[PDB]
Amino acid sequence: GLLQGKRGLILGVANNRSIAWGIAKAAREAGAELAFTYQGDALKKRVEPLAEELGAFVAGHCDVADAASIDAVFETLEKKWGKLDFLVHAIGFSDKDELTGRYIDTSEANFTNTMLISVYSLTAVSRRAEKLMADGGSILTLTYYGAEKVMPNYNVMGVAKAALEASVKYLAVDLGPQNIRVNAISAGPIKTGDFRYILKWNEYNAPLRRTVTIDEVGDVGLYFLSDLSRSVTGEVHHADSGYHVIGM
Amino acid sequence: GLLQGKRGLILGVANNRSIAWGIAKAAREAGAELAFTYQGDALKKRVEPLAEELGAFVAGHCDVADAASIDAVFETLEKKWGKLDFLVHAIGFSDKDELTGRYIDTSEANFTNTMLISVYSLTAVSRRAEKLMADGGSILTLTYYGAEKVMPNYNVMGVAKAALEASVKYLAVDLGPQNIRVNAISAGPIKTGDFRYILKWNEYNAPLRRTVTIDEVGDVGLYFLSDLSRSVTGEVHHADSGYHVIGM
Amino acid sequence: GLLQGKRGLILGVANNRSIAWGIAKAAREAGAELAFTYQGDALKKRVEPLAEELGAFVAGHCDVADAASIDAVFETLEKKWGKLDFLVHAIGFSDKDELTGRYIDTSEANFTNTMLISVYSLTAVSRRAEKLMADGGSILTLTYYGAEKVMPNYNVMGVAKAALEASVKYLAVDLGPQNIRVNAISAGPIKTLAAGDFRYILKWNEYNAPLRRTVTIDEVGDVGLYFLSDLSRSVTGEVHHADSGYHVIGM
Amino acid sequence: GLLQGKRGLILGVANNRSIAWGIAKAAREAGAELAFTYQGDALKKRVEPLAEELGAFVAGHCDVADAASIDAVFETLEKKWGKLDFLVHAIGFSDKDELTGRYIDTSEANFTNTMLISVYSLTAVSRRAEKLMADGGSILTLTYYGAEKVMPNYNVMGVAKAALEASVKYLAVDLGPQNIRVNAISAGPIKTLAASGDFRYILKWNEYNAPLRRTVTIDEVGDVGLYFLSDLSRSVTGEVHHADSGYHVIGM
Secondary structure, eight states: OTTTTOEEEEEOOOSSSSHHHHHHHHHHHTTOEEEEEESSHHHHHHHHHHHHHTTOEEEEEOOTTOHHHHHHHHHHHHHHTSOOSEEEEOOOOOOHHHHHSOGGGOOHHHHHHHIIIIIIHHHHHHHHHHHHTTTOEEEEEEEOGGGTSBOTTTHHHHHHHHHHHHHHHHHHHHHGGGTEEEEEEEEOOOOOOOHHHHHHHHHHHSTTSSOOOHHHHHHHHHHHHSGGGTTOOSEEEEESTTGGGBOO | OTTTTOEEEEEOOOSSSSHHHHHHHHHHHTTOEEEEEEOSHHHHHHHHHHHHHHTOEEEEEOOTTOHHHHHHHHHHHHHHTSOOSEEEEOOOOOOHHHHTSOGGGOOHHHHHHHHIIIIIHHHHHHHHHHHHTTTOEEEEEEEOGGGTSBOTTTTHHHHHHHHHHHHHHHHHHHHGGGTEEEEEEEEOOOOOOOHHHHHHHHHHHSTTSSOOOHHHHHHHHHHHHSGGGTTOOSOEEEESTTGGGBOO | OTTTTOEEEEEOOOSSSSHHHHHHHHHHHTTOEEEEEEOSHHHHHHHHHHHHHHTOEEEEEOOSSOHHHHHHHHHHHHHHTSOOOEEEEOOOOOOHHHHTSOGGGOOHHHHHHHHIIIIIHHHHHHHHHHHHOTTOEEEEEEEOGGGTSBOTTTHHHHHHHHHHHHHHHHHHHHHGGGTEEEEEEEEOOOOOSOOOOHHHHHHHHHHHSTTSSOOOHHHHHHHHHHHHSGGGTTOOSOEEEESTTGGGBOO | OTTTTOEEEEEOOOSSSSHHHHHHHHHHHTTOEEEEEEETTOOHHHHHHHHHHTTOEEEEEEOTTOHHHHHHHHHHHHHHTSOOOEEEEOOOOOOHHHHHSOGGGOOHHHHHHHHIIIIIHHHHHHHHHHHHOTTOEEEEEEEOGGGTSBOTTTHHHHHHHHHHHHHHHHHHHHHGGGTEEEEEEEEOOBOOSSOOOOHHHHHHHHHHHSTTSSOBOHHHHHHHHHHHHSGGGTTOOSOEEEESTTGGGBOO
16 A cells, blocks of 8 residues: 555545545555544534544644644644654635636735635645654645636636745755655646636546546545655646646 | 837836836836835935936835825826826835745745735736726736746745736736736846855856846836837746756 | 847748748848848749848848758858848748648658758757857747647647747857847737638637737737847847737636 | 556666666556567667566567557557557657757757657657557656756757657647547656766756755656556646656756
């Protein structure tokens, strides 16, 4: 099993229909012991059974816009495991209304919030994961082609994900000498404002003529979490049925 | 006069050694009418005479953090001219101390402050610029290769500039149908936190074997503001003596 | 004029509706003295009157495969001018028939010929140009977004232009220490008034490019002017989109 | 187990220290049945013992400059297997002496030959491979950061790899509908034990500057190759993927 003996934290599992869950399931299948956080006691009740379903330790409450939450979570894991092998960062909020409007009308609070939650969160968490990862490890986050090209209904998140992708590079350089690798999967859109059209566009135009699934993305996750990707860091990897190559 | 009959606002002229000044000078040589903002009482002293050398109208103090300020400036500009043809965004800050350390040790305050000032500011001023630019124009900002690859002593600003370059693309789409162009110049380091070595690195490894000058970047700026560049938007353009092509 | 007291060779001026001509015309209007080349004996009958218009010296036949012809052209130029300030490379060919099929069906002869004419020719010519630009200069080639992303009806010309953009970078490192700049314009598609699925490609750009219009040879001409002039003296190794912003569009 | 039930062709196995071999090894250990060709000047008797180390079937001589040669290989595999799951394209050539020169001094014959062997070959072999991959599959090639940035001692191979990377994208568009993926690994330089260009300097530079402070090995790239041949990467096509200890992100 590719993660036999490995222990990891998955941030952002809130249901069984997300990429985070896809990665979690795949990593569990590969032999990983997992740890889930939940965002706010409303989610706790949905996250508990999901954790049971993959044998996952529930590591505590974790809102990324709260530095104390994050310290607590890693407190719990440092006592339980005393080491992390991998970390999966699947956190990302942007204001829903402003996505359907023009980027230029992006408010400041949204900009700052999106940036803090979608971008700084990784740096914050990665900072702490570093203490638990002195034996080496893999840090993984999620992005989208909207960081590279203008994509509809993405606006400030496009801007944010461009920042996330750069931060992955910078983080790769900080942590690499400790044999900690940092990477991002740029996922295509996945069947779950104006989402139906985007999905149909990928389906018709993406080389492989289908939208990606969470199982597909999960296995890409698995590769990044596994030793197969030992030599890979600071990389943005497209798991999008080839969509990124299409210029028209 | 490439900019004969055009009026533009330069944000970020705080001295006579900056790229902003370089662009303003070249823009003034090409026949532009200019407007300068300043930042605080200390800078109003130094800006008034810089304004005088180029015949630049002083449009008032501007703190991009303060939304009230941005609207005052553009209220003033609307009164005085009633139209802008171009806007030069040469505003950026990140905490001096944290540049010298590890990106991963970046503080939230510095992350947020840098993002607000270095990135959101352009979006904020471009939103106002648009009302005054209805019948066309050019928006120009500054960036650095640290957005694309990891560069030393740069940390969160790299991440910020990745977001700014992304923002340029999104703004270009928002403003393009009104014939407003949005572009960035990726400037190499310029003689004026471990800067000597970076300059000497570019001097010896850049194809043209020299660091760029504010006069050189100003003329690239001139191109962007001019109608020479009227088919060009959403572009990150290297004025760095070719440094960006170098892999080793 | 931004090119007053400057002399350059434009390669590829076959007619008066092309980006080469656009650049030629803009360069001349900015005070430059031009030299044009031809290929065909038929094309000599088309280029001569174009050169006349811009007061260009017809520097002669230049089959970019025939290495003898290239040396002969730059020999002429060094007799006449002794220096060269700029060179525009607007040469490129690929099989018209194979553009409309699948890339994967590209024939070896077409691949090699496209590669040779569209990519190596710049290197070939920049090698002779180097000797005449000892006081520095600007070398300018032409590319298209189909080099960065898959675009329709382009196939192996995409593979070729990706090669060219790569060659521009390596040439920039070779020639920069003599203060010779090597750049490429990534031009959008241009509406022609003359005689597979090109109208549709133009339309797509018309509706989807940020500036909601396709670029013209006058507009690209002016970008070429920028690259020829001293405005761009800090700029080398660069691939510059003159495409109404189309390149930022993801969907 | 990742390639159990899978059959694939590896082009470019000439020794036991190349990325091709590392990929072959990793693929065989993953349960794959392999076929090797022997390329250009490589001898049947030299590739035979490598084939035999992995119970690989030698599919015959292949010269990528001879169209009939490519057809023969694929006719042979078409007889033996009738179906191909993957293809590893590890072919590349450029004149050794011009790599030390300036790119601009590249001769026409070297340009053309490098392009034919290093770039066209993948398009040529994918064209034949398509016909054997009706149920889809994975096509893998090898590239180097020299295709993206100017790197030393690479010259026209950089230009060529750039074209190759572009060709991966176009190929991926053509073959995607048949569920066939096409990808490239951008490998870092690899230290060799064999006889010894300015390569030592290039290795040392990667070692000291790449985020992970080490140069990659053929077993490491072998495993990245494994991923691309496996169904782990079935959502991935058109990709240039860096197996280079992160070197690609370094600006200075």
